[PDB]
Ligand binder design. Structure first.
Ligand SMILES: N[C@@H](C[C@]1(C(=O)O)C[C@H]2OC[C@@H](O)[C@H](O)[C@H]2O1)C(=O)O
Length: 256
């Protein structure tokens, strides 16, 4: 039989979540969400079974000064996993070191905050000095700011970096808790802002999208699966299945 593929992933609602049960769950059955449905579809098309493993360091992946990667990106570079199936952003820096599939979803960075402020854009956010802001540590949003040559975003990076110990949060849940309980705005991908703001009516998006990009399945460079995964994603795209999956996991609208 075909070797069981190792899938690296990360907990992120509604992509990958713990299933709630009153009885024991083991292996892949512990997880549910958009990315688990995606895996069920992809595996049917490609002819494999798989083993879902949460990334040990709990990170998406960024490179340090020495050029060393961490998170799911490192798992792929080091051939610890066959595929990364997660809300994993397709970026220039990552594409040089792993092989991404074509995108299964598009999104852009925007701002998550509470309601009631006059802040209406990243320019407003960077200029004012009343509320702090940051991003999840070692993801693509952090890297977007780290790499930017746009003045507003360079300032925002300098600010985030100066207060990194505090401004850069471990995960999105810590980020949202910080937004809810302190004067802190979270830089977050728009599809995640969409999800949270239809559930917690105290939260809102600030401004529009500051970029545009996609999520893709990651594989190690040279992977014999990437092209087959791309073909399968295009099939799911054209058949309307990706759209159906988004509707299933984001349903519905709960806030004014
Ligand atoms: N997709 C990113 C990870 C992350 C981000 O950096 O925004 C981290 C986490 O942040 C919240 C929201 O943007 C989304 O659920 C997640 O995106 C990546 O591939 O590095």
């Amino acid at each position: 039989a075909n070797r069981t593929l190792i899938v690296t992933t990360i907990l992120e609602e509604p992509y990958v979540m713990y299933r709630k049960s009153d009885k024991p769950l083991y292996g892949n059955d512990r997880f549910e969400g958009y990315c688990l449905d995606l895996l069920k579809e992809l595996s049917n098309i490609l002819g494999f079974i798989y083993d879902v493993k949460l990334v040990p360091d709990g990170k998406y992946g960024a490179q340090n000064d020495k050029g060393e990667w961490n998170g799911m990106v490192k798992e792929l570079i080091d051939h610890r996993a066959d595929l990364a199936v997660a809300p994993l952003t397709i970026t220039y820096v990552r594409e040089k070191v792993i092989d991404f599939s074509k995108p299964f979803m598009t999104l852009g960075i925007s701002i998550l905050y509470r309601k009631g402020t006059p802040i209406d854009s990243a320019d407003d956010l960077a200029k004012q000095t009343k509320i702090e802001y940051g991003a999840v540590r070692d993801g693509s949003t952090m890297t977007f700011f780290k790499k930017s040559k746009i003045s507003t975003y360079e300032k925002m990076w300098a600010f985030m970096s100066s207060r990194q110990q505090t401004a850069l949060v471990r995960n999105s849940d810590e980020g949202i808790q910080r937004v809810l309980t302190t004067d802190y705005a979270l830089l977050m991908e728009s599809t995640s802002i969409e999800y949270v703001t239809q559930r917690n009516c105290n939260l809102t998006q600030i401004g529009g999208l500051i970029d545009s990009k996609g999520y893709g399945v990651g594989t190690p460079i040279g992977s014999p699966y990437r092209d087959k995964i791309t073909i399968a994603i295009l099939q799911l795209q054209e058949e309307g299945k990706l759209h159906m999956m988004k509707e299933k996991w984001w349903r519905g609208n709960g806030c004014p």
